[PDB]
Amino acid sequence: GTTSVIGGRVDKDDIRVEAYGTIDEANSHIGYAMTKLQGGAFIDIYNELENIQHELFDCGGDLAIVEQKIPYKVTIVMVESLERKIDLYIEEAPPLERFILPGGSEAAATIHIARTVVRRAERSIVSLQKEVKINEVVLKYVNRLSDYLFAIARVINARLQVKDVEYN
Amino acid sequence: GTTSVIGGRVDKDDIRVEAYGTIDEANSHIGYAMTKLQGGAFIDIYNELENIQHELFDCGGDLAIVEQKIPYKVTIVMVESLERKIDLYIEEAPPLERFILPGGSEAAATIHIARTVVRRAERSIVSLQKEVKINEVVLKYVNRLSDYLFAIARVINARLQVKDVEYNR
Amino acid sequence: GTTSVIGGRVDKDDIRVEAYGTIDEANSHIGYAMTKLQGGAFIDIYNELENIQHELFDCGGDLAIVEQKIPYKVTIVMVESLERKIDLYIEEAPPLERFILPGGSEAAATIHIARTVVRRAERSIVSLQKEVKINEVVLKYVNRLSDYLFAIARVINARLQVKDVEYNRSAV
Numbered sequence: 384g385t386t387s388v389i390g391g392r393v394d395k396d397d398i399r400v401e402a403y404g405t406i407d408e409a410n411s412h413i414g415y416a417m418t419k420l421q422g423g424a425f426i427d428i429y430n431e432l433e434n435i436q437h438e439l440f441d442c443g444g445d446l447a448i449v450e451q452k453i454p455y456k457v458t459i460v461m462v463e464s465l466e467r468k469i470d471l472y473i474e475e476a477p478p479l480e481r482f483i484l485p486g487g488s489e490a491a492a493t494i495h496i497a498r499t500v501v502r503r504a505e506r507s508i509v510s511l512q513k514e515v516k517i518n519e520v521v522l523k524y525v526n527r528l529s530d531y532l533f534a535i536a537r538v539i540n541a542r543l544q545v546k547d548v549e550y551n
Numbered sequence: 552g553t554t555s556v557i558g559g560r561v562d563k564d565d566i567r568v569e570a571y572g573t574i575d576e577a578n579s580h581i582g583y584a585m586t587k588l589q590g591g592a593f594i595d596i597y598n599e600l601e602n603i604q605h606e607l608f609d610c611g612g613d614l615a616i617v618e619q620k621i622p623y624k625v626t627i628v629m630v631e632s633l634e635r636k637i638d639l640y641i642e643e644a645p646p647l648e649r650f651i652l653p654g655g656s657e658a659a660a661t662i663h664i665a666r667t668v669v670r671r672a673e674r675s676i677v678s679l680q681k682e683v684k685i686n687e688v689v690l691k692y693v694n695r696l697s698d699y700l701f702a703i704a705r706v707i708n709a710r711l712q713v714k715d716v717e718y719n720r
Numbered sequence: 721g722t723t724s725v726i727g728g729r730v731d732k733d734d735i736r737v738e739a740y741g742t743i744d745e746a747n748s749h750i751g752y753a754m755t756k757l758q759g760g761a762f763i764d765i766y767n768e769l770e771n772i773q774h775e776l777f778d779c780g781g782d783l784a785i786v787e788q789k790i791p792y793k794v795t796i797v798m799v800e801s802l803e804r805k806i807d808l809y810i811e812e813a814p815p816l817e818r819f820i821l822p823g824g825s826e827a828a829a830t831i832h833i834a835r836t837v838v839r840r841a842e843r844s845i846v847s848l849q850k851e852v853k854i855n856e857v858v859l860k861y862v863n864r865l866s867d868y869l870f871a872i873a874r875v876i877n878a879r880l881q882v883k884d885v886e887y888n889r890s891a892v
Contacts, residue, residue, distance in 0.1 A: 384846065396846040404843065407822070408836035414823025415833055436821045437888045444889075456889065484604045485575075486582025493583055499576035506572065509552060509564040548582065550608055652773045653744070654751025664752055667745035674741065677721060677733040716751065718777055 389444070390452025402511045403443040405504040406525070410439040412497040419490040424542050428535050431468060435528065442525065445518040446511065455518040462520060465527040472534035476541050482550040487540040491547075494539060498532035501525060558618025566679045571611035573672040574693070578607040580665035587658040592710055596703050599636060603696065610693060613686040614679065623686035630688060633695040640702035644709050650718040651701075655708040659715075662707060666700035669693060726781070727789025735848045740780035742841035743862070747776040749837055753830035761879055762827075765872050768805060772865070779862065782855040783848070792855040799857060802864040809871035813878050819892060820884040824877040831876065835869035838862055 386395050393399055413432055420429045441456040448455065473479075485495035505525045511517055540547050553560045554568060561567055581600055588597050609624040616623065641647075653663035673693045679685055708715050722729045723737060730736055750769055757766045778793040785792065810816075822832035842862045848854055874884060 394846065396843040396850075401840075401843060404836070404839055408833070408840065411822040411829070411832040411836045414821060415826070415829035417823055418826045418829050433821070433885070436823070436885075440819060440821075440887050441889070444892075482608070484582065484608060485579035486585055486604070489583065489586040492579070492586050496576070496579040496583055499572065499579050502572055503569075503576065506564045506569060509562065512552070513564070548604070550605055650777070652751065652777060653748035654754055654773070657752070657755045660748070660752040660755050664745070664748040667741065667748050670741055671738075671745065674733045674738060677731065680721070681733070716773070718774055720774060 388447045388449055390449030398507065398511045398514065399446065402504070402507040403446040405500070405507045406439055406443040406446065409497065409500040409504045410436055410443075412493075412500045413439070416490065416493040416497050419493050420539070425490070425539065428539065431535075435531075438524070442521045445521050446508065448518075455520070457518055457521045457524055459520055459523070462523050462527055465524070465531045469527065469531050469534050472531075472538045476534070476537040479537070481547075483537070484548040484550055485536075486548040487536075488543045488545045490543070491536040491539040491545070494532055494536040498529050498536065501529045501532060505529065556615040556617050557612070558616060558620050561617065566675060566682060567614060567617070570672065570675040570679045571614040573668070573675050574607055574611040574614065577665060577668040577672050578604055578611075580661070580668050581607070584658060584661035584665055587661060588707070593658075593707070596707070599703075603699075606692065607696075610689045613689050614676065616686075623688070625686055625688045625692055627688055627691070630691050630695055633692070633699045637695065637699050637702050640699075640706045644702070644705040645715075647705070651705070652716040652718055653704075654716040655704075656711040656713045658711065659704045659707040659713070662700055662704040666697050666704065669697045669700060673697065725784040725786055728786040730786070735844060735851060736783060739841065739844040739848045740783040742837065742844050743776055743780040743783065746834055746837040746841050747773055747780075749830060749834035750776070753827055753834055756825075756827040756830060757876070762876065765876065768872075772868075775861065776865075779858045782858050783845070785855075788853075792857065794855055794858045794861055796857055796860070799860045799864055802861065802868045806864065806868050806871050809868075809875045813871065813874040814884070816874070816884070818890075819887040820874075821887070822873070824873075824882040824884070825880045827880070828873040828876040828882070831869050831873040835866050835873065838866045838869060842866065 384394060385392050386400060388399060413436055417429055417432050438461055445455045445457050486492050505522065508522050508525060512522065537547055552562060554563050581604055585597060585600050606625065606629050613623045613625050654660050676690045676693060680690060705715050721731060723732045750773055754766060754769050775794065775798050782792045782794050823829045845859050845862060849859060877884065
């Protein structure tokens with residue numbers, strides 16, 4: 384009925400468990416999207432995604448810490464790293480002049496799914512924060528991550544010469 | 552901790568955000584399934600899915616309308632459209648004689664996943680509706696959409712010469 | 721705003737519906753993963769997953785039963801079956817001493833997603849059990865299933881010669 388966390392134990396359906404459990408779910412979706420980005424044209428994105436998976440483990444670990452039992456690993460440095468990539472990718476992709484619908488190339492499509500799962504994880508983290516103090520940087524990281532995912536989804540389509548699917 | 556919606560702002564974990572966010576999740580699964588349905592053999596289903604992505608996006612917009620600054624976009628006409636297609640596809644598919652397990656062709660399998668996500672979205676909309684007034688057509692649309700997805704999943708397997716996976720020990 | 725279940729009716733957003741609805745979601749991911757495992761190299765895992773889809777369907781049926789209207793279908797025998805396969809696959813897979821990134825081959829990746837959805841279903845079942853009586857065996861089954869999925873995910877990658885990627889916090 385309960386599970387152990389870092390510095391204590393909580394019920395298996397505790398919002399804390401839901402939080403890092405959904406981070407795990409998002410990390411798994413990214414893992415799948417990566418199998419679609421093994422092309423030589425995406426070595427950079429694949430490599431960045433791979434690192435993000437480790438950082439997601441960092442996020443899950445931090446969220447599992449009760450009363451700062453051990454040091455937090457997610458820092459503002461990792462958030463700013465994502466922000467720089469987001470800027471670069473927005474620059475690479477064609478100008479955004481229409482509302483985008485999720486889809487296009489299969490790689491971009493799976494990235495859009497991962498994007499929504501990351502956003503779902505963010506909501507769970509917000510819920511956790513409402514009852515216990517957390518590494519607030521984790522929330523910022525996950526928030527920027529969905530923006531990063533949206534950005535590379537459009538870059539993935541563009542590199543493959545596929546127009547983004549637009550609301551029209 | 553909050554996010555801007557149409558007419559104001561709400562907490563990021565507000566049941567309203569969970570609702571349109573999950574609608575977005577379902578829409579993304581549909582986008583992925585569509586990448587497996589581009590052939591000439593699926594032009595009818597693919598076009599209907601293209602339209603559904605728009606209506607799903609509209610559903611999300613209607614759920615994000617806190618301070619009704621604008622009229623809702625999802626109408627009953629769109630729900631009836633799904634109902635007619637559901638009957639059409641049930642007719643096309645083989646007789647349903649056993650319980651169906653999700654799977655079969657890759658295309659059908661992804662459509663089945665989308666179906667379960669649409670149902671998860673429906674549950675969030677039900678919860679939202681209990682707390683605030685919503686465009687009730689959205690709930691009806693989402694409810695019909697999962698039946699439509701189930702229907703085309705079977706049609707997809709049939710067209711692809713694959714038998715549906717059945718519960719049969 | 722309600723839905724029919726076995727021996728009654730409940731609100732469509734009832735924790736009970738969330739539970740079997742998520743079992744359904746997990747079952748659908750398994751079904752998709754199965755399309756990637758039809759090769760001769762995975763006959764054993766594919767057949768086990770075929771059976772698991774039935775058991776998962778049974779889990780949902782058991783969760784939809786209000787006040788033991790009918791006998792439960794999920795039994796401890798099926799839980800033990802999972803446990804035996806778990807040891808078997810941990811034995812086949814290379815030694816594991818660190819957390820690893822979920823992914824690798826397309827098949828393993830989809831299995832990892834299924835694993836996380838099964839765990840999400842487990843949380844809903846835990847919540848359900850706090851409100852009403854349920855077939856406790858279902859909770860034990862879903863609990864073991866996520867470990868089984870983790871195990872075959874690593875085996876699938878191993879069989880495809882895909883090496884696990886260990887978490888970069890090397891002291892963990």
